[model samples]
Target: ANDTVVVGSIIFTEGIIVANMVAEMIEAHTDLKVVRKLNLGGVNVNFEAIKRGGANNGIDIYVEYTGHGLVDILGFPATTDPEGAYETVKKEYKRKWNIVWLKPLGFNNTYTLTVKDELAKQYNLKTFSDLAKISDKLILGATMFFLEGPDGYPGLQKLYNFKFKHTKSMDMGIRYTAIDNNEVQVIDAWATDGLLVSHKLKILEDDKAFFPPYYAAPIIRQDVLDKHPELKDVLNKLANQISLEEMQKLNYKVDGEGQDPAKVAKEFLKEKGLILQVD
Candidate 1:
């Protein structure tokens, strides 16, 4: 096949990391030329690009989260069952868009509530339900998108029957700073963010099971898979390969240490023995 194996990614550091990893692994294992469409904006934009793919129109594959597929993209209610969530989207994507969802990469980057260690110890907080007890006394810092999304602050508040005394809207990059600086006692975070480790923040458990499983996985065009059946096994080798802890370390290297995404990806693949060492 002379056509390049284009991969798309959402415009985020973690997404780019995964995109590069996918590109590297595919290129190492197959003769297909891999081209990355990194920083392809938001999920909707990336999804649209894949749905409209052709010679130069969009990507042949991309990393996507199951929860986002079910609730955000396909209009299904969130579920905690990882397999059910994955299967639902797998079926829907095949029926509706002819896209194929490969095996998951083994991690849940769910929406997490986090607090500084001192604050958590001060209030004896360990879960979303625990935060509800003192919500009126705490202030929250969140990205504007999460602050306003239907499945975010508003829904979380309604589901938990709690609201903070005040909420501060900031860029995603600054939310962690706001927390570490003591500007906000509580904030929204992803489970796999490197800052959770670097900032010593504690991820509050979802005792009430409010958030759905957001497991990451590769989604490819059915035509691509049919044309290159070997691609399935090549990609499936990554199934259940990365855990939350490992993903956080990877994210930390790029976001916390300022390393190149491609280099980080290459190192990870080589270490995992998914790709041969380069000399």
Candidate 2:
């Protein structure tokens, strides 16, 4: 084996954190070394990196969201069954892109809409259905993409049993501000994002479980595994170890404290005993 393994990550703080944590865990618990790390921003870039990794066969692994593979890479809709979606895309990626999707973490961190707790309580809304029950009484806000994207709020409404009224497309940064001033009752957000905890937004319960899980999974080129089969099992052990609450806490560190994503990830791994504590 080489002196170390090389890995890549999306520039987004969370993805970087995850990559860093994996490196730390591998370093601490295994004999493998992480020699190269690159941060490419956004999911689209991450997917492109996967293809590039296959071509070079240098990059070992990277994190990817579940729904992104299902809806975008594999051309399935959001309504696809989660396990089936993974297998279908995993098979296709192997056939088409020569990639392998390892075990997925047990967390559902997808796009969601939230309201201020005071507002939610003011209206006694508990579930998405409950919010939709009084939808006509409220205005909705979402990212421009979420409104336009097929897997976004609109598609969620058409596919599942969720619908909201007085909807408007706005930039993500401004949506929460609008919510603060009563410009809107609902704000579209990602469950893993730090803003949900920072703003203390009330995430409406997805009682219907219609929203597919956006659990983080490791994507590696099949050749990487064929050459180093042990890497696959090494990464799989991380699956489902990242619980929902842990995600929020790690998110808060980056989103709330504005720390570097890698540092937060390192700390998280140490806390989880996946990596040794540093002095």
Candidate 3:
């Protein structure tokens, strides 16, 4: 009981995969038991669970984004520089939340504007700046949260200095069909979303770094780390382990190729030699 570490994650394919990665890493590297509460919920669910720092239902460890730690958790402004944001959150979280961000997982899964391949090729749009230039002719489809959140549409509009011809707030799945039927020309998506690969949605680059960098990292309660000091070094070994393309591929393997998330995570860890065993 005291020797166990609780690894939790958000409810998403990539997060689930990462949760498994952390769990498996601990299982192989330490003599400690790992209780996996993968796919728990959104950021709040995991964050509050870890904050509890208790047993039974509390999460001792979970992968979180630096951007979320900064803006969503601490109510700070978005930081464009990746390292700057990481450092800021790392310190702020430690000071304010008593949580520690271990190390970045080498990928920025920020919110990105995506267009159909045909539209991107037609508009010659490779970046958000290019999309802004052509925004007057495009219709944007996004979830209600994105359309209303300060970190979402309003922020994007202000930073990009552009507006779509029309904007529609729709469900997550409907955006794809809406794009398919030409109801919308662009949609918001995660840079490393596996569904982007599965649906073949072309992600536009954030040339302006409008949104904060969402670098994934394992954040643990200070009490948990105080108990298991070795975990810091063990988890830091995963720093910069999964690049953007690698993460997309990992998620696609589960989302598109129908592989198990846990198995896929184990394979990637073994491939990078971060863990001793895959079996």
* RMSD of each predicted structure: 1.6, 2.8, 2.0
Mark the regions of model 1 whose C-alpha exceeds 4 Å error after superposition: 1-3, 54-56
* Candidate 1 residue pairs in clash (backbone atoms < 3 Å): none
**Which residue pairs clash within candidate 3?**
none
The Cα error of candidate 1 at residue 249, in Å, is 0.9
Instruction: TM-score winner between 1 and 2, please give it.
Output: 1
Top-scoring candidate (lDDT)? 1
Q: List model 1 lDDT by residue over 1-279, tens digit each.
A: 545788988778789989898998889988888888896775498899888864558888999999999988988888558899999999999999999999999999998889988888988898899999999988999888888976888888988877798899988478887888888888888899877889988999888777888999999998888778888999998999999999999999988999998899889989998899971
Tens-digit per-residue lDDT, 1-279, candidate 2? 454666777656667778887677667656766754655655476677667663354466787777778777777766666687778777878889888888887677777878889988889978888887777778888888888865677656764445565788889478878888888889888777777767878888776666765778888877767766777777887888887677887888887788877778777666766665661
| Stretch of 10 with least lDDT, candidate 2 | 50-59
Per-residue lDDT tens digits of candidate 3, residues 131-247?
999899889999888989667899889989767999999885899889889999998888897878667689988888778879999999888888999999989889898999999
**What residue runs in model 3 are displaced by over 4 Å at the alpha carbon?**
54-56
The 0-to-1 C-alpha lDDT of every candidate, in the order given, reads 0.87, 0.74, 0.87
Error of 1 at 218 (Å): 0.2
lDDT of 3: 0.87
